[PDB]
């Protein structure tokens, strides 16, 4: 639908329903710029059936740290509240399309 | 307090973090426990291993594993033991203090027999006084 963005519990309440991406970026990595278009071009093919969130890990890395992640990029793919998928590494658009589409 | 825990992290895990724990233990002893771990994390690089037998240290018993957020976060210091970025770039929650104390890595040394001793070297004295002088600050 678009990139939404997170924070602390905003997460949990983007998440609790649907098919959810949520993803984490932040200044420290180079892939923070590259999965950041790749989500804009995946939410402008098929985000007509799936959200997408991303939690800026300088700002707002309180709920990552909390689940535990630490790591550029890392995403989260969840469904109706809990976590299906996990990835700790960058992936081209066709790569993350099929990550989630597994799922949703 | 007996044992305040604290991190390496830094590229492979291979070599400097594997250095810089057998440094740590002849200065910080059983009031601390001392963690490394990386991207892809799991190895002993025996470079590291002839670093610290250049001191008297043993450390060829030594392991490693990824990143975990279990310990990590537990910890109160966080040494980035590189300056580089293919250790994932990772971005140390707020829970823990982060500071760089690497700034070159010996398992990138050019190669020669001659370049990997002094890369090794270099490296071996800049973290044993690295880790010497935060037994004595506490940092």
């Known amino acids: ?104 | 307090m007996e044992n305040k825990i604290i991190y390496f992290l830094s590229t492979g895990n291979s070599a400097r973090s594997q250095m810089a724990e057998g440094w740590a233990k002849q200065y910080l002893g059983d009031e601390w426990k001392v963690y490394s771990a990386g991207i892809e994390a799991h190895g002993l690089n025996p470079n590291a291993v002839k670093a610290m037998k250049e001191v008297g240290i043993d450390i060829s018993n030594q392991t490693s594993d990824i990143i975990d957020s279990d310990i990590l976060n537990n910890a109160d210091l966080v040494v980035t033991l590189s300056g580089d970025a293919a250790d994932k770039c990772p971005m140390t929650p707020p829970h823990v203090k982060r500071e760089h104390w690497g700034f070159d890595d010996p398992a990138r040394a050019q190669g020669t027999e001659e370049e990997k001793w002094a890369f090794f070297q270099r490296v071996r004295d800049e973290i044993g006084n690295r880790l010497k002088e935060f037994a004595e600050t506490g940092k």
């Open chain 1, 1 to 104: 639908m678009a990139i939404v963005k997170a924070t602390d519990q905003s997460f949990s309440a983007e998440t609790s329903e649907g098919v959810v991406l949520a993803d984490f970026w932040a200044p420290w990595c180079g892939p923070s710029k590259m999965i950041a278009p790749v989500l804009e071009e995946l939410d402008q093919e098929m985000g007509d059936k799936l959200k997408i969130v991303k939690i800026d890990v300088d700002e707002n890395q309180e709920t990552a740290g909390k689940y535990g992640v630490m790591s550029i990029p890392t995403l989260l793919v969840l469904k109706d509240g809990e976590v299906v998928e996990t990835s700790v590494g960058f992936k081209p658009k066709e790569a993350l399309q099929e990550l989630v589409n597994k799922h949703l």
